[PDB]
Amino acid sequence: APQQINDIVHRTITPLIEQQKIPGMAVAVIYQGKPYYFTWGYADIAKKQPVTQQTLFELGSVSKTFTGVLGGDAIARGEIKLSDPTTKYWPELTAKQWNGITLLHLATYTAGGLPLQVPDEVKSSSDLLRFYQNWQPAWAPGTQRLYANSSIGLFGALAVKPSGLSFEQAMQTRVFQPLKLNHTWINVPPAEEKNYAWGYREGKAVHVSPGALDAEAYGVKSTIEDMARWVQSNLKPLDINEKTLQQGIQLAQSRYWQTGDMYQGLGWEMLDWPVNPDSIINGSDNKIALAARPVKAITPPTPAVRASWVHKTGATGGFGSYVAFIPEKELGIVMLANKNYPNPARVDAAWQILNAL
Amino acid sequence: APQQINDIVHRTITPLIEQQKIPGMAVAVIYQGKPYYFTWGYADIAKKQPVTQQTLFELGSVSKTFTGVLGGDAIARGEIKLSDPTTKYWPELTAKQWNGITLLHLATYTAGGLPLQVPDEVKSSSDLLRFYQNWQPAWAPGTQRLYANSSIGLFGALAVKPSGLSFEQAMQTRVFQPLKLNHTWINVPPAEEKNYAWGYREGKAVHVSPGALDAEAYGVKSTIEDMARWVQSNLKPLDINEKTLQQGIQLAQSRYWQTGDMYQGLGWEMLDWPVNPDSIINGSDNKIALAARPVKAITPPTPAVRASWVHKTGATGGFGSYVAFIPEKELGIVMLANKNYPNPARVDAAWQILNAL
């Protein structure tokens, strides 16, 4: 680890952890293409287990970059089209509303108001179908962005339908595997239970709860080393072999919509680089991030731009994560914690390290 | 040349030739990746110069494919965006109508009615400026497809604006060169003069006349060997060294609009495969080909599909050409003639062969 890196790291993360009261944290820095790992604290507080590079953390919403790529793959494979209507994959989706609602809308929260979370009462696929059928939109599709699980989640489920595979089976075989994402799970196997960190909420050890469209919207668990690869991959997709995956990645970072200085990709989110840290930091605020905003459509879209600050935050009840990278500079970082803490906090920490280069 | 290539070729072309009365022709077939050339008659009748595979032909509208790839390149280069307004690149293009006219519109003949041809009285950049200032649309941008030189021609001129290069310089350096098209010209160098075929029209030997936007709309001259390479490339853009050329290519075969069973790409046209010969044969007729047609917007577009029938016809006063390939089959063909003869004749001929495999 080059000093300068170690430096900004200690400088930056130590206070974050102390301030936020974070139990365990793992950090990776991709500098000029190479990763540098940092670890601190506890995965299991009472069992005194440390956070190692093999520690699995709940990525929460970071899962969405996965789902977005997996769908970019499906596109690249010719199996689906963003331009297709939802009903084409869910025939029984008879409601009119569904009319002009495309895969694209689902994928980018522009469907006109689908809910952030899927009701906890919705258990069966059946429940699920009532749910979607009975939903009426507030806006015209493609007019306003409203971050929602029930949206990109549905997109996930459907995007794998042609493949004949289960969401998780496609993910595995289509992304993890090819990428050597050996310790990435939707479901964590017994073999890895020992490495599965505990989330902490109000001082209680906790694990993501089960719910509809979870795998798709927030079910991925990973290690920093994996997240590191995840980063390199996304940083330089041209280097991956699977042609479809390689294309998928690029599709996920293409710009489909604009809202302010942000661009909505598939799963991912981008801003031009050089960025204005404010925008990023403050924008991370759920008060902004979770809000309903009017979108500008990019017709036709702008393919993945090298000069962007690409990134994503995610949270579960006991975990908080963040990802970001500058494709043009071959630089990025990944931060995973067993505590859900203020986003803005995560992004600023991110901004210091990276800004220090 | 495997027999059943030579066969179907002789079987099909030889007659075509007799039938249309074509003075010289050159054909190439791409089979399983490899190319196979066929030659016939003369290039220079009077002089009795045989068509060779070093013989240059005016591709007319086939140029447009080059224009399209050059165009997708520039976008891969972050140099331009299809979603941007024309005025952005030609600021003096102030008239209202130009309003919501994007580069996309321009590249795809979807601007609302620009004329097929640029009046020949239009000589200066000035003349050119009046022309477009005074042009009044027949429809709203993005509603109708109307094949046009003045459309894609301007797309080509502007797309190179930011690179600072002349249209030709950019093409040479950006496209011809990296592909090794050593005998492809917009303007023919003296040393190539002796290999440059004459066109024949009404028993007259003729070469394309100069015109505004000619380079961009129909200015290239090429050989079959080169055209071959052109074909291969297009068949497997993923093999191109140049990242931006490589993307440009796949950008040029993305589906932006649909009209009938056809999809408008950049320069290129495509249909799914298996294709219906009728539709392709009959569509090739100018009565249809040059007719406005309502387009359906592909939102967002469909990235290049491998199972497609991709092609383009082209002509100048004394030459007729055609190209078609099936990326999924590693199959394609090129027909170059020193005479402009019925397109449907070209498409059928082409179909026969490709259909034979």
Curated annotation (Swiss-Prot), chains A, B:
GO terms for biological process: antibiotic catabolic process; response to antibiotic. Gene3D superfamilies: DD-peptidase/beta-lactamase superfamily. It is an enzyme of class 3 (hydrolase). The keyword Hydrolase applies. Its EC number is 3.5.2.6. Its main location: periplasm. GO terms for cellular component: outer membrane-bounded periplasmic space. Inhibited by the beta-lactamase-blocking agents avibactam, enmetazobactam, relebactam, nacubactam, vaborbactam, taniborbactam, zidebactam, and beta-lactam-analog boronic acids, via a covalent binding to Ser-61. Inhibited by non-beta-lactam, benzo(b)thiophene-2-boronic acid (BZBTH2B) and various cyclic boronates. Not inhibited by clavulanic acid. Inhibited by O-aryloxycarbonyl hydroxamates, via cross-linking of the active site Ser-61 to Lys-312. Weakly inhibited by citric acid. Changing S61 to D/E/G: Loss of activity. InterPro entries: Bact_CellWall_Synth/Modif, Beta-lactam-related, Beta-lactam/transpept-like, Beta-lactam_class-C_AS. Pfam families: Beta-lactamase. It catalyses: a beta-lactam + H2O = a substituted beta-amino acid. Changing N286A: Reduces binding affinity of inhibitor compound 1 about 17-fold. The class C beta-lactamase family has a specific amino-acid numbering system known as SANC, for structural alignment-based numbering of class C beta-lactamases, or else the simpler name structural position. A multiple sequence alignment was used to derive a consensus sequence and then the consensus was numbered taking into account insertions and deletions. This allows use of identical numbers, e.g. for active site residues, despite differences in protein length. Class C beta-lactamase which confers resistance to penicillins and cephalosporins. Has benzylpenicillin- and cephaloridine-hydrolyzing activity. Has weak cefuroxime, cefotaxime, cefoxitin and oxacillin-hydrolyzing activities. This is Beta-lactamase. The lineage of its organism: Bacteria, Pseudomonadati, Pseudomonadota, Gammaproteobacteria, Enterobacterales.
